[PDB]
From a paper:
Cas12h1 is a compact CRISPR-associated nuclease from functionally diverse type V CRISPR-Cas effectors and recognizes a purine-rich protospacer adjacent motif (PAM) distinct from that of other type V Cas effectors. Displaying a “Crab Claw” shape, Cas12h1 contains a distinguishable recognition (REC) lobe and a nuclease (NUC) lobe, with the two lobes connected by the WED domain.
We further reconstituted the wild-type Cas12h1-crRNA binary complex (hereafter termed the surveillance complex) to identify the activity of Cas12h1. To gain insight into the function of Cas12h1, we determined the structure of the surveillance complex using cryo-EM to a global resolution of 3.00 Å. The mature crRNA forms an elongated stem-loop structure containing a 36 nt repeat-derived sequence larger than other type V crRNAs (positions –35 to 0). The density of nucleotides 6 to 26 in the spacer region of the crRNA was not observed, indicating its flexibility in the surveillance state. The surveillance structure revealed that the first 1-5 nucleotides of the crRNA were the pre-ordered seed sequences. A detailed analysis of the protein-crRNA interaction showed that nucleotide A(1) forms hydrogen bonds with the side chains of R8, Q688, R639. Specifically, the flexible lid motif is kept in an “off” conformation through hydrogen bonds between L660-E658, D659-V700, N671-L466, and L676-R634.
Author numbering: 4 to 102, 174 to 615, 627 to 661, 671 to 763, 778 to 809, 815 to 870
RNA sequence: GUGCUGGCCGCUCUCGCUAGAGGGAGGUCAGAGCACAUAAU
């Protein structure tokens, strides 16, 4: 229970023979990574033609046999034990030091380094080599796995709709339009009704009239989107290069040195500078950073003890904000890293490991993530916890819930195999959206509409047609130096740019106070990128935007962890939503996990199916109000109820977390969760299902491949689910008076959603 | 210590011109509070 972290200090001065040491290490690394990589049969794409060609692993094997000759097997074992790593690889730096697998191949190939007489030099050299090769092997395997899975996804999805949409795409490319989901959807929609005046889309609807496209018009809204997704996925699959790039080798790599026999370095912190004193290669003077504020270090037999605390960098001299100092941080240091960035400045890195209680992480690992917690875990659970849940959305960024649970305690809630609980802080919204979230949607809408206008401009002028009155009227509202159909596109690009730039300045002056207000600016900027990118292709028929996204993810992860500081576990829905695709589906969860892990708090990911449609109290199905997304409607006991969508989602996430997500929402006619559900709710798991009454399902110890839904303690068929959602819909269409039900009320006897016991 | 900000000013490239709009280096003047696990992709 030591969490790894790192940060950098800038190196001001140097003494002794330091630069010679660094240059020799980097040159030997560059020379020998090449040889030890081409020892590995790795496929790669040539960088000299943007990956147009490549080298197959069979060609790589032939070249390897050409180079090594009679020493293939020994190098195979050496490189295998290098990639595996660990203690066996910790005493095998013999590849360069003149004084065990790497020892004998030197006598067979005669490889030597710049300083074969310096044990530390060779130690760091092979450490850098092994780290650089390991950073690439993992990426290579995950790349091949992803390409295979992404191909097999297309190989399993074939239908007449897919081929017909492929033909439609080829026809559109011949007409120079390019196929998108919006055009496909709206053209299918408008093909059914004959047109009167020219429309924002005309070529597509005109070309959809012919009988060859009769298959599209008779297809189901579910199959059409599936065919479109398959077509786009196949396009990317045929655009992606075969193999990963072989790593760039002229660039410099970070050099690790520590106290464990790799070398000698002593850290002593004084009033003005930090000093690192290598015994023979000189000493380095480093300035103080606000990250390691009030830094103190003390020697220990095989470690260092750092005692620092974060501060605020007020680079402004006449700062107007009161300086604040974060809490003390007790960290352990084992190694340091030295590197030269391309700008020409050295940096010193301090990888420090934190100490925290392992109990919370063990609790969130084996108990709340398993349907079978073995008996020693229950006997090892405490008698008290505070838990929380969060629902992440573009609007109402975080909707948190706090609850207190414990064995031997009574409350409305229920925790599987543990006991009951009650709410501490009622379901609510952590922070309402700022005033500028509304104005940062119109901009993105304008950008995307401009993209579509350019897309139809290409085809219309290729065909010698006349632009529809809608686009011409839409682009005429903005001042332009002329009236041509091409001038009024850039005369609108020049307005979107100014609006986005004014937002960028004004929100940066404040340090990006609101969060859901900056997540909208990120969408606006992402859409503007693709507007400009498509702009410079009309004939051909940055890291400052990927850093704002990183900052926004870190701010979101900090906003979450600040609220649940006193909690022990937090529940999040398994996001493999308009916000998860904006930041990332894989890194936003990683950043949230890191932020919570910083404070010794666990995190548990629960199934996301149906957590926004059930009734938390009664467990019945509800119909989400399409007109107003923030309200969800139910129908219990001849009365219609209304509830807050975000609070319903948070409570359902909490209920699924407290139930380990073992109660399903839908299943075909299984897995561990549904097996345990059938074992507990009903007699056994290996049981057939038979329909009875009118939409109800009786479990008899028939139907196959059907939707069976859990609602109120009984399974229903797909038709009866649609009937219920219809019942409710109709009830709200005749204005029936609903009731307002609050989840934080203390008069609730129980919560039954996702509760099968 | 690292990251994220526009305004203006010449130069230099890519498409169009009933017309300009975007890209890359550099100069200069203002802004500047709140996050950090670093390397790569
Ligand atoms: Mg939700």
């Amino acid at each position: 229970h030591e969490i790894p972290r790192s940060q950098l200090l800038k190196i001001k001065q140097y003494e002794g023979s330091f630069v010679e040491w660094y240059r020799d290490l980097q040159e030997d690394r560059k020379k020998f990574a090449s040889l030890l990589f081409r020892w590995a049969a790795f496929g790669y794409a040539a960088r000299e033609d943007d990956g147009a060609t490549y080298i197959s692993p069979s060609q790589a094997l032939l070249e390897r046999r050409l180079l090594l000759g009679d020493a293939e097997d020994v190098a195979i074992k050496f490189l295998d034990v290098l990639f595996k790593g660990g203690a066996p690889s910790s005493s095998c730096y013999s590849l360069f030091y003149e004084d065990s697998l790497g020892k004998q191949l030197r006598e067979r190939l005669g490889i030597k380094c710049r300083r074969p007489h310096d044990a530390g030099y060779c130690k760091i050299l092979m450490e850098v080599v092994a780290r650089q090769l390991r950073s690439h092997n993992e990426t290579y395997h995950e790349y091949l796995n992803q390409t295979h899975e992404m191909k097999t996804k297309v190989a399993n999805n074939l239908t007449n709709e897919f081929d017909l949409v492929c033909e439609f795409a080829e026809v559109l490319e011949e007409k120079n339009y390019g196929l998108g989901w919006y055009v496909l959807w709206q053209g299918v929609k408008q093909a059914l009704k004959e047109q009167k005046k020219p429309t924002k889309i005309q070529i597509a609807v005109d070309q959809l009239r012919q009988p060859k496209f009769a298959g599209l018009l008779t297809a189901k809204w579910r199959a059409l989107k599936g065919a479109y997704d398959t077509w786009k996925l196949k396009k990317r699959l045929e655009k992606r290069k075969a193999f990963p790039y072989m790593p760039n080798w002229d660039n410099d790599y970070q050099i690790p040195v520590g106290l464990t026999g790799l070398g000698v370095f002593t850290l002593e912190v004084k009033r003005t500078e930090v000093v690192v004193d290598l015994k023979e290669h000189g000493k380095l003077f480093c300035s103080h950073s606000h990250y390691f504020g009030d830094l103190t270090a003390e020697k220990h037999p095989s470690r260092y003890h750092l005692k620092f605390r974060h501060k605020l960098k007020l680079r402004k001299r006449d700062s107007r904000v009161e300086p604040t100092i974060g809490p003390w941080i007790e960290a352990a240091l084992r190694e340091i890293t030295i590197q030269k960035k391309p700008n020409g400045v050295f940096y010193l890195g301090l990888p420090y490991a934190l100490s925290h209680g392992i109990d919370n992480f063990q609790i969130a690992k084996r108990f709340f993530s398993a349907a079978k917690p073995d008996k020693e875990v229950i006997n090892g659970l405490p008698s008290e916890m505070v838990v929380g849940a969060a629902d992440l959305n573009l609007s109402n960024i975080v909707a948190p819930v706090k609850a207190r649970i414990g064995k031997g305690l009574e409350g409305p809630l229920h925790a599987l195999d543990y006991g009951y609980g009650e709410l501490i802080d009622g379901p609510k919204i952590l922070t309402p959206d700022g005033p500028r979230c509304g104005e940062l949607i119109s901009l993105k809408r304008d950008i995307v509409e401009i993209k579509s206008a350019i897309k139809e401009f290409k085809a219309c002028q290729r065909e010698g047609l006349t632009m529809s009155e809608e686009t011409t009227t839409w682009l005429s509202e903005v001042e332009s130096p002329s009236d041509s159909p091409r001038c009024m596109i850039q005369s609108r690009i020049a307005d979107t740019s100014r609006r986005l730039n004014s937002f960028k300045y004004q929100m940066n002056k404040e340090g990006y106070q609101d969060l859901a207000e900056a997540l909208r600016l990120l969408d606006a900027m992402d859409s503007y990128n693709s507007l400009l990118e498509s702009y410079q292709r009309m004939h051909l028929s940055d890291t400052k935007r990927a850093s704002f996204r990183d900052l926004l993810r870190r701010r979101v992860a900090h906003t979450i962890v600040e609220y649940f500081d006193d909690c022990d576990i937090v529940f999040f829905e398994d996001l493999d939503n308009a916000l998860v695709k904006l930041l990332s589906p894989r890194t936003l969860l990683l950043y949230i996990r890191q932020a919570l892990e910083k404070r010794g708090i666990g995190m548990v990911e629960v199934a996301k199916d149906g957590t926004s449609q059930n009734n938390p109290i009664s467990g019945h199905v509800g119909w989400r109000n399409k007109q107003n997304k923030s309200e969800i409607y139910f129908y219990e006991d001849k009365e219609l109820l209304v509830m807050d969508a975000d609070e319903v989602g948070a409570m359902n996430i909490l209920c699924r977390g407290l139930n380990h997500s073992v109660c399903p929402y839908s299943f075909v006619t299984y897995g561990k969760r549904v097996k345990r559900f059938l074992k507990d709710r009903y007699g056994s798991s290996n049981v057939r299902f038979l329909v009875a009454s009118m939409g109800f399902v009786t479990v008899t110890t028939a139907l196959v491949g059907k939707r069976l839904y859990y609602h109120g303690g009984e399974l229903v068929t797909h038709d009866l689910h649609n009937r219920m959602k219809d019942e409710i819909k109709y009830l709200v269409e005749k204005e029936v008076l609903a009731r307002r039900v609050s989840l934080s009320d203390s008069t609730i006897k129980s919560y039954k959603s996702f509760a099968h016991v």
